[PDB]
């Protein structure tokens, strides 16, 4: 058997159509260096998402890689149960309280982004207990939102394809409107009228439902996996005074913003948002690790307390809740960010990343270029009056992708825009070889349409 | 300013009283190495628990570490969305279908075993929604159980600490008897035909709830976390039978019994188990890692492999699922456990510790030692006959657990039980060096509680 054949005959593939798999095989990754990787027939492609978004340092950074080795011979394995703890998990929750955009008062750790959503949910609803709100535990989150995959964190989720067949959500978890101007705002509708519209649907929602019943909203401050959604100018200041006129918790979900991808530390920093509640993962290690945390401000923690006195210990944690050696790696992944500027180094790659792809604003299947700091989209539209896909919904970013692979680049198609969000440490050369195989990818998908107009 | 301080002042420990934390602060855990732990003062302990149940090879084997190195500078991060792949992924894959004690068609990777029981319920719900069966939803699993903490995972978990204050279960999360015959036979009653109540209590739940609303029944093959409960003779045969009479799927956790806890390579073969699906982690990777796994057998695959096609993809998925350096560990795990034989060294070191244990039986606070392979647990109570704790359930044994710490061993209190799961690799005198601090802290709690 082949190494294809044995991928084929044992494993059940995530975000994968399980009989296509069966017909075409895998794409075998065999190796990577700096923003490459290499394929089992050694053909190499720029990792222009960064691997999910995550690959922060590159595929060889030896800095955390010896940090792994050091902490491996020191102690492989620790809990933090019961009063244990262990050096890395406290020195990376100093280092992540002291560089909060806000004041926070504790870190929470989990492996993914899924389960530290899902330990919000519950860390929200323990808190209201503890306060005597018994009532008060509804979600509100949005359309194309994107939270995770466990049972509630699908809940919040607002990709349809994550709940279809799923029998979510589940009920006391609510949606309001997905702010992505281009889509949803009415024909000749500014920025500021359409967040206006958007923060009388989560006021008229809360009326609606009970105000004494919502605890909580929760949004990315640029959605990541629903389409590089960029909010429009007013939308977080209003949506806050909203929230903060019934007593509703904020919860920024940075798991893509952290890190510097936005232009600043924090999409919180970029988007003005004073969130109650912070949750990180995917370049918090570069994805070395997998690794997740929650930052909780002293409101938040203080009741958590209270109630888990009463109770005789908080009744949650998982097996690798803050791994010593999945610390370790983030807390040098943190250093490097800082000691080598990788923010500001960022910021100037994503104003050559995005005047690159504007030299084709005005091409007929090109529908809005977006994005800020070094994450971006290019939305292709078969129509640029009517907004119209090209056949089926899909079908360009799908042909994209597709050509841009032959073409030794890995981007992602969410419906039909392609993402941008590649490693921090990207030089400008590089940006330039990403824009050149957009480019050649963009001339392959117009000669297959064949626009004439 | 003190590394203590520090932890005081910035983190949230899990499965802690936080105000009672603010005070004392943190015991620091320095190193490790073969089956010892050593904090920040130079006190070294037997890990008497392994971790968290888990750490098969202890603190310092050398060959997992160089797995690890090897797989980082090759290719440290890559993922299995979209058709992607990767070795590690699909040679571990490969290795668990064909170790399986049942046949088993596919693999699933997970962070966690909360992560995975989470996901077993989602792909338990997508299957009976493509055979067409919508109403086939409701999960049946036992009071003590131990499944995890997510929202659905601790509501399969049956035990109230993981459930009080955090409004779980959610609906359709169902729980019959815990089978513990010490706590829960009628006067008199034998094992069989406690055995045989247990599986009437079941068959009765699932006429009253309706056979066609009953997707699944889990259960760890013998509960740890709950309190090291083996299960009465017959109980699995007569469980099965009443599960196979109305089309219910049988998921065996197996998170603690992989990998030779429990004197064969999983608790299924011990307790003679046909599951649909395993759930796996913790022995999986000595926790070197944070991995889990998923099997399922044919059926179970093939309605939800033709579901993803009528959905266009498997709508499912975690960063890390497969990451390369986890699986290149666990891989690297599951060799040296075969190549050193490492199943029947537990199962002779286990018989060792139950002997050792044994001697104590007829201790004025002893109510019950129970254990299997290389896992046991003693029961502590403040009168034999009643079966009655000291003041209150979980008095004896915090003070145990305390006392065992001082004597420079960790163990873990359920209630008033102390916990034995040493690692694989344990020798026959530091079993010795086990049961001896173990009878330090017995005498200590009999002198506490006094006449
Ligand atoms: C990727 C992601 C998550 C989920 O993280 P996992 O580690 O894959 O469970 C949550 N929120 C956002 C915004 C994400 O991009
Ligand atoms: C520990 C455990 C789990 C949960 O594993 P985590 O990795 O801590 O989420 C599930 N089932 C059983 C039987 C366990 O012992
Ligand atoms: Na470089
Ligand atoms: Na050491």
Redesign the pocket.
């Known amino acids: 058997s082949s190494l294809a054949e044995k991928d084929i005959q044992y494993q059940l593939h995530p975000y994968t159509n399980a009989r296509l798999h069966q017909e075409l095989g895998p794409l075998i990754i065999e190796r990577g260096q700096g923003i490459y990787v290499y394929d089992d027939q050694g053909k190499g492609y720029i990792e222009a998402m960064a691997g999910?978004?995550?690959v922060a340092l590159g595929f060889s950074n030896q800095r955390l890689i010896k940090a792994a080795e050091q902490q491996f011979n020191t102690l492989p394995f620790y809990h933090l149960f019961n009063h244990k703890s262990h050096r890395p998990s406290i020195e990376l929750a100093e280092k992540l309280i002291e560089m909060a955009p806000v004041p926070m008062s504790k870190v929470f750790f989990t492996?993914?982004?899924?389960?530290?959503?899902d330990t919000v949910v519950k860390f929200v609803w323990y808190l209201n207990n503890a306060l005597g709100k018994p009532a008060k535990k509804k979600f509100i989150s949005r359309v194309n939102?994107?939270?995770?995959?466990?049972v509630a964190?699908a809940s919040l989720?607002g990709l349809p394809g994550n709940q279809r067949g799923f029998d979510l959500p589940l009920p006391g978890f609510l949606h309001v409107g997905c702010p992505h101007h281009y889509r949803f705002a009415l024909a000749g509708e500014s920025e500021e009228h359409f967040a206006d519209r958007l923060a009388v649907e989560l006021e008229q929602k809360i009326l609606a439902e009970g105000p004494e019943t919502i605890a909580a909203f929760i949004g990315?401050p640029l959605?990541?996996?629903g389409g590089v959604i960029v909010p429009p100018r007013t939308y977080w200041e209003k949506i806050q005074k909203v929230c903060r006129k019934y007593d509703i918790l904020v919860i920024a979900?940075?798991?893509?913003?952290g890190f510097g991808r936005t232009g600043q530390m924090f999409g919180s920093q970029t988007f003005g948002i004073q969130p109650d509640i912070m949750?990180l993962?995917?370049q918090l290690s570069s994805s070395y690790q997998?690794i997740?945390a929650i930052l909780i401000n002293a409101p938040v923690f203080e009741g958590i307390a209270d109630q888990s006195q009463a109770l005789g210990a908080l009744g949650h944690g998982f097996t690798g809740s803050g791994h010593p050696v999945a610390t370790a790696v983030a807390l040098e992944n943190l250093k490097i960010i800082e000691e080598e500027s990788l923010v500001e180094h960022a910021a100037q790659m994503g104003q050559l990343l995005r005047s690159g792809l504007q030299h084709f604003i005005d091409h007929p299947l090109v529908g809005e270029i977006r994005g800020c700091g070094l994450i971006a989209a290019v939305e292709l539209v078969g129509d640029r009056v009517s907004k119209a896909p090209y056949q089926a919904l899909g079908t360009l970013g799908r042909y994209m992708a597709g050509r841009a692979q032959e073409h030794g680049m890995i981007t992602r198609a969410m419906g039909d825009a392609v993402a941008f969000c590649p490693p921090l440490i990207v030089n400008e050369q590089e940006v330039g070889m990403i824009v050149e195989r957009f480019a050649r990818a963009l001339d392959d998908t117009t000669q297959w349409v064949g626009p004439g107009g």
């Open positions: 999910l978004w995550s492996n993914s982004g899924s389960e530290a959503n939102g994107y939270h995770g995959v466990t964190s989720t990315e959605m990541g996996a979900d940075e798991v893509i913003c949750v993962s995917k997998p997740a």
